[PDB]
Write a protein that binds this DNA or RNA. Structure first.
Ligand SMILES: [K+]
Ligand SMILES: [Mg+2]
Ligand SMILES: [Mg+2]
Ligand SMILES: [Mg+2]
Ligand SMILES: [Mg+2]
Ligand SMILES: [Mg+2]
Ligand SMILES: [Mg+2]
Ligand SMILES: [Mg+2]
Ligand SMILES: [Mg+2]
Ligand SMILES: [Mg+2]
Ligand SMILES: [Zn+2]
Lengths: 161, 38, 99, 40, 100, 177, 162, 174
RNA sequence: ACCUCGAUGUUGGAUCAGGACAUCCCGAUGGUGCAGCCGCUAUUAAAGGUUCGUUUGUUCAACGAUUAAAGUCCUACGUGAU
């Protein structure tokens, strides 16, 4: 009762990691719909509290929530007090549910809006270079422009299905 | 015991043996044939 | 002079600190750092070390979901490596194409 | 990380190179008006 | 019955995908500690004529034994328990900025 | 977690006592998992400037297992500072003289070479046997799994497994053996 | 197998040879085309020193290795099994195959030192007092070179020297 | 308990009086030291478990001194023991079968002739002394040009090390 | 001819030495053309010891008497703010 590919159980006969069996894709496909519908049903009824959203702004990913501040090291050419929308959102999460973009969420699923509240120059930064025995010494001071944004609201819409 | 890098039997009675990490040549008939691997 | 040259070290040290924090949280879920970062790329989830380190500290439940996704994607690749392409690709192994 | 896998998918080895994450405008007005194009 | 991670310690993670496959849904409800996995709190801890008035038990100890006792109860080294000079005590910021 | 600010800070930066069983385990693998716990490398909130280290308790340090000929080949050398004070003892000699020296030196060489290294050694507890003081035993939390899985001796196999494993050859009946 | 017993009655010694039960090879080998019992069961490069079930079938009751012409193994696998048997006794995984002690001998109490993957005999090893420079380090052998081709499930190959 | 092999009994605390010659029947002049045991008592007993050591420790005192020249902690210790304070207190390692009740006096009859004993005491302090008298170095000649170097240690180390080894014989208190 | 030419003259001795072992002596052990004493040779061993004098600036050496032996070296050819 031994197959041609049979090996008796030894230390190296089987891989050290236990065998893993993936679910049936046909059976799992409808199982995903049940989970998505349940999570979508949590949005229409508003069964969520504070939401944290990961947005891509100024070549940077910010883990922001509502009513918080973020400092941006460049000028947006926007008057202070103007309300704008952050189009790129990569992740929106709650206490019980989390949605992932691939790599970005649709504009019909999440909306993050911020406000320009302060535009100021950076504190003086010292840029000095020195080389010994070469009379090489020069000092430069730069003040990069900065912009502060406050996240006002993070709202989602029931568009999962 | 004479230390030799290469151990060679000097008669039919010499026999090689592995002891204490290095090969030895023992010869009861000729005690001067004893060698230790260097 | 040290002030100017420390601006490169600060960027370097921040990323190294993030990797250790990401590695620490992955081991609590039975994963290694290469297994987490590598398998999140194949899911088109482009999250940098700064976010993952913050998620591993302030959003433990969200990080576990990412660990499960990376582990699931890791298992899908092994199953695809055993086959010769006859079986279809994994559910999470699909890639969204952009034109 | 993942540069080799991306090149096999027809994408850039660096995700900052091109694609929706980089090419798209980073912000827009709340009213819906499009933002001026970024310098990059 | 497949599960990428054991749903025993942190939460019950349920991976899912949308119809278009452009969004990954992660439903992770929090798990509650069962009642059977906990221990009860230890609530419990004559002919006397004179009331037991509070008696001071602050025994005098030298600098040596005082630090040795502290280094054993906090499992640290003796070096941190020695004082510092005025120069270092004046450089310390007594009004540091506070976040959150 | 809706905690107050002080209790929330205390819980995150709390110290957790771990247990290690060193019987039939390599000292280095014991030290590798003990190094991260002592430094706090197993926490996502880890940082060098924050004393986030924990307590590690290692029992049965007398019954450690050395791979290869490390009992005879490995040498632990130290110098007393006086002339002719250069002492070199093997692992076997050191183990008999001090049952906890081998594990202590392996862990001590893995911690960062800084002032915090001596502080982390204070939070490390070694016990040659399975006996543990009550105060140290009453505050343990988690027993970390052993890195190396102990192979089973030939007498520990049940008859079910012995009979399951097939014999590969048929010896002759006239062989004296 | 065959056993020899000597019984002396009336100052006369009688030597007899009595045949005992002999185990039989399990039927239906996975690979009947193999030449030696190792590859006949697809056990090549798939056993280690800790697999005492496989090693016990090629050893004598006193722990001695069996001859190659009797078991029928090939020259390559016989040496690999021979080294695994040596490392099995040194690791203490064969407590029922101890050497036969002659009458009137009581072994002294000796330091019980746990060890495994011991290439050389413990009594024939000298300590490494001078490690040497980094480019000329004196490494400590771990395991056995004859198991270099064993199936490794990890990307890093077996480290035979520490 | 009766005497058993491998047992150690307690000793005494004696006072060195002086020296006196002593002749044997063999005609050899042997010099002996008169050790006077006075006011020798056992102070306290510490069991092997409480000793944190292989042997059990026993406290012995000697040479009763004034009660006005001792600290409060020492005086109250003798108050409950009912003995005058002792000048020098030594600790002896004994076995379980050699325990002696505290307050028990001891006499010179504890030892017998023909028994070899070990005497421990502080040596005569000679203060700060040079290498010539402390370590026996030869020094330098008094004549033949020597300039301000007759009792000096000379070289203390080599130039390559650039340091002095610990334990090097240097002038100090002897 | 790389370092030292804006304060180490070098040698030897005196003083005190630390270290290597390729061991002069003490220890253990093979071989011997090893009877025994003496010897020769090889492995192991650096814990301890390794003299006093005449001429000579001497190092060295010569011979004087000895000793279980009077080892080979290195250390800024140790040590000269001793
Ligand atoms: K000078
Ligand atoms: Mg970088
Ligand atoms: Mg005096
Ligand atoms: Mg003189
Ligand atoms: Mg003068
Ligand atoms: Mg003078
Ligand atoms: Mg030698
Ligand atoms: Mg010189
Ligand atoms: Mg000189
Ligand atoms: Mg000088
Ligand atoms: Zn011969």
């Amino acid at each position: 009762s031994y197959l041609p590919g049979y090996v008796p159980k030894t230390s190296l006969s089987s891989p050290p990691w236990p065998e893993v069996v993936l679910p049936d894709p046909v059976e799992e496909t409808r199982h995903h719909a049940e989970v998505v519908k349940k999570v979508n049903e949590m949005i229409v009824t508003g069964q969520y509290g504070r939401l944290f959203a990961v947005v891509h702004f100024a070549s940077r990913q910010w883990k922001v929530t509502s009513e918080d501040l973020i400092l941006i090291g460049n000028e947006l050419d926007l008057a202070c007090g103007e309300r704008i929308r952050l189009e790129k959102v990569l992740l929106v999460g709650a206490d019980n549910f989390t949605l992932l973009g691939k790599p970005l969420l649709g504009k019909d699923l999440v909306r993050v809006e911020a406000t320009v509240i302060e535009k100021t120059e950076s504190w003086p930064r010292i840029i000095m270079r020195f080389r010994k025995r070469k009379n090489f010494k020069k000092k430069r001071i730069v003040t990069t422009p900065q912009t502060v944004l406050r996240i006002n609201s993070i709202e989602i819409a029931p568009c999962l299905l | 015991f004479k230390n030799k890098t290469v151990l060679k039997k000097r008669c039919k009675d010499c026999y090689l043996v592995k002891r204490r990490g290095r090969w030895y040549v023992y010869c009861k008939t000729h005690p001067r044939h004893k060698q230790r691997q260097m | 002079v040290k002030c100017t040259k420390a601006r490169y070290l600060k960027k370097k040290n921040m990323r190294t600190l993030w990797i250790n924090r990401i590695t620490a949280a992955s081991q609590e879920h039975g994963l290694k750092y290469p297994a987490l970062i590598g398998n999140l790329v194949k899911c088109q989830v482009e999250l940098n070390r700064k976010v993952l380190a913050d998620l591993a500290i302030y959003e433990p439940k969200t990080f576990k979901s990412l660990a499960a996704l990376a582990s699931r994607r890791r298992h899908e690749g092994f199953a695809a490596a055993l086959g010769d392409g006859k079986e279809p690709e994994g559910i999470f192994s699909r890639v969204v194409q952009y034109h | 990380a993942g540069g080799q896998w991306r090149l096999q998918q027809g994408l850039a080895a660096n995700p900052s190179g091109y694609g929706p994450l980089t090419e798209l405008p980073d912000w827009s007005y709340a009213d819906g008006r499009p933002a001026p194009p970024m310098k990059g | 019955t497949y599960s990428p991670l054991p749903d025993d310690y942190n939460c019950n993670v349920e991976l899912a995908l949308t119809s278009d496959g452009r969004t990954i849904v992660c439903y992770h409800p929090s798990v509650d500690i069962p009642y059977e996995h906990t221990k009860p709190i230890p609530r419990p801890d004559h002919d006397q004529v004179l009331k037991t008035r509070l008696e001071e038990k602050v025994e005098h100890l030298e600098e040596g034994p005082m630090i040795e006792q502290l280094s054993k109860m906090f499992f640290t080294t003796k070096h941190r328990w020695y004082p510092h000079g005025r120069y270092h005590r004046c450089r310390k910021n007594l009004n540091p900025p506070k976040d959150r | 977690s809706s905690f107050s600010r002080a209790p929330q800070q205390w819980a995150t930066f709390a110290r957790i006592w771990y247990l290690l069983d060193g019987k039939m385990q390599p000292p280095g693998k014991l030290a590798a998992m003990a190094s991260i716990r002592l430094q706090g490398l197993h926490k996502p909130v880890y940082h060098a400037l924050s004393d986030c280290g924990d307590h590690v308790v290692i029992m049965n340090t007398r019954h450690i297992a050395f791979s290869g000929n490390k009992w005879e080949q490995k040498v632990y050398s130290s110098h007393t500072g006086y002339p002719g004070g250069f002492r070199q003892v093997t692992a076997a000699q050191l183990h008999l003289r001090d049952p906890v020296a081998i594990v202590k030196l392996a862990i001590y060489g893995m911690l960062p070479k800084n002032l915090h290294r001596r502080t982390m050694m204070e939070r490390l507890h070694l016990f040659p046997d399975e006996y543990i003081p009550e105060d140290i035993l009453k505050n343990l939390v988690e027993e970390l799994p052993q890195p190396r899985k102990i192979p089973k001796r030939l007498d520990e196999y049940t008859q079910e497994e012995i009979d399951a494993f097939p014999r590969l050859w048929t010896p002759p009946e006239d062989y004296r053996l | 197998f065959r056993e020899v017993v000597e019984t002396q009655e009336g100052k006369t010694t009688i030597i007899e040879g009595r045949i005992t039960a002999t185990p039989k090879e399990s039927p239906n080998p996975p690979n009947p085309s193999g030449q030696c019992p190792i590859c006949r069961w697809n056990l090549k490069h798939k056993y280690n020193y800790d697999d005492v079930l496989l090693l016990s079938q090629f050893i004598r009751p006193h722990g001695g290795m069996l001859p190659r012409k009797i078991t029928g193994l090939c020259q390559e696998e016989h040496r690999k099994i021979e080294e695994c048997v040596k490392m099995a006794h040194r690791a203490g995984l064969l407590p029922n195959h101890r050497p036969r002690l002659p009458e009137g001998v009581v072994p002294k109490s000796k330091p019980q030192l746990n060890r495994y993957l011991t290439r050389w005999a413990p009594g024939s090893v000298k300590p490494i007092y001078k490690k040497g420079p980094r480019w000329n380090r004196v490494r400590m052998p771990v395991g056995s070179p004859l198991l270099r081709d064993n199936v490794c499930y990890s990307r890093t190959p077996w480290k035979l020297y520490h | 308990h009766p005497w058993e092999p491998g047992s150690f009994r307690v000793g005494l605390i004696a006072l060195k009086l002086g020296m006196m010659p002593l002749w044997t029947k063999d005609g050899q002049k042997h010099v002996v030291t008169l050790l006077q045991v006075q006011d020798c008592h056992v102070l306290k007993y510490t069991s092997k478990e409480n000793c944190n050591g292989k042997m059990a420790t026993l406290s012995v005192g000697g040479k009763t001194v004034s009660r006005f020249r001792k600290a409060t902690s020492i005086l109250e210790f003798y108050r409950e023991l009912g003995l005058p304070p002792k000048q020098t207190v030594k600790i002896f390692n004994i076995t379980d079968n050699a325990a002696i009740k505290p307050g028990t006096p001891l006499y010179a009859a504890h030892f017998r002739p023909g028994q070899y004993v070990d005497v421990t005491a502080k040596t005569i302090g000679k203060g700060f002394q040079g290498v010539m008298k402390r370590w026996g170095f030869k020094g330098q000649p008094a004549t033949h040009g020597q300039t301000k170097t007759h009792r000096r240690p000379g070289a203390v180390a080599t130039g390559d090390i650039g340091r002095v080894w610990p334990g090097t014989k240097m002038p100090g208190k002897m």
